[PDB]
């Protein structure tokens, strides 16, 4: 059918989920199901139930919390043996105020990570140039953020994500994370010809998480078909 690939992994859903803010693994289990999601990202935190509430999907370990590449490669290693999975969502955020990633740090971490046989999914600013570098490094994806994380502003980074759409064929699969607050947001991104979206705050922070998880599902499907259907021209 209409399937894409993260490196050697073939996914069908273009809707990836995140396990943040779910007030319990129960409504989380429901949401992940309603979204028909195949992949859900998880963090690696200090030990002060989840692993079984996330069975049925694949686990994507991220290096959230990491302020440097050194701390990033560190969380990735632990994330790898904790899930046994080969891939990781590279994330390097110095100032958690806005949660914006570091260009060079994330670039250096991506290099070391791929030399360690990792499949890097680089969380990054909407930097097409940096995206092209990440792609030449051997990244299986590039994940430009739509807007400040958890903000739910929307596709505030539209003008730049259009360039990603234009250089779609030179980049690895383009997944948009961090910034989406409504399913109409995801649809918009998918109508541009982007490969997938990653939603977290929008679904969990909602009154009816399972319902919203479905909404987002329909929206990624709707947006994707619109693109393949060849929209009319204004």
């Amino acid at each position: 059918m209409d399937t894409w690939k993260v490196g050697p992994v073939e996914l069908k859903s273009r809707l990836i989920l995140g396990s943040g803010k779910y007030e319990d693994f129960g409504v989380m289990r429901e949401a992940i199901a309603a979204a028909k999601a195949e992949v859900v990202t998880v963090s690696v935190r200090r030990v002060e139930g989840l692993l079984e509430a996330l069975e049925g999907v694949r686990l994507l370990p991220n290096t959230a919390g990491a302020r440097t590449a050194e701390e990033a490669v560190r969380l990735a290693r632990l994330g790898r043996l904790l899930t046994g999975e080969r891939w990781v969502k590279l994330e390097v955020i110095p100032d958690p105020t806005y949660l914006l990633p570091d260009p060079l740090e994330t670039l250096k971490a991506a290099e070391r990570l791929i030399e360690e046989d990792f499949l890097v999914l680089p969380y990054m600013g909407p930097d097409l140039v940096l995206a092209k570098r990440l792609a030449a490094l051997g990244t299986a994806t590039v994940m430009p953020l739509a807007a400040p994380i958890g903000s739910g502003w929307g596709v505030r980074t539209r003008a730049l994500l259009e360039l990603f759409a234009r250089e779609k064929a030179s980049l690895p699969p383009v997944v948009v994370d961090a910034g989406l607050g409504l399913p109409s947001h995801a649809a918009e991104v998918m109508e541009l010809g982007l490969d997938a979206v990653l939603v977290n705050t929008a679904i969990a922070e909602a009154q009816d998480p399972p319902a919203m998880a479905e909404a987002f599902r329909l929206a990624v499907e709707a947006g994707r078909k619109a693109y393949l259907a060849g929209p009319m021209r204004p």
Partner: protein
């Protein structure tokens, strides 16, 4: 004086298993990092801690 999850503790002389037991966590859910060496909770080294060891005990949690 071993560093445990970023905190100085009088752990010298004890083993990972011993501390993790006292901690009271299930091992099959945590991963242990000992001075940059990464171990599964169920496979932690049976070596006694040294003054200066840096121990991290991590598990898969929420985020994404």
């Amino acid at each position: 004086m071993v560093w445990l999850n970023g905190e100085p503790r009088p752990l010298e002389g004890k083993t990972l298993k011993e501390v993790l037991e006292e901690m009271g966590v299930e091992l099959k859910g945590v991963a242990v990092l000992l001075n940059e060496e990464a171990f599964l909770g169920l496979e932690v080294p049976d070596r006694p801690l040294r003054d200066g060891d840096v121990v991290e005990v991590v598990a898969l949690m929420q985020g994404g």
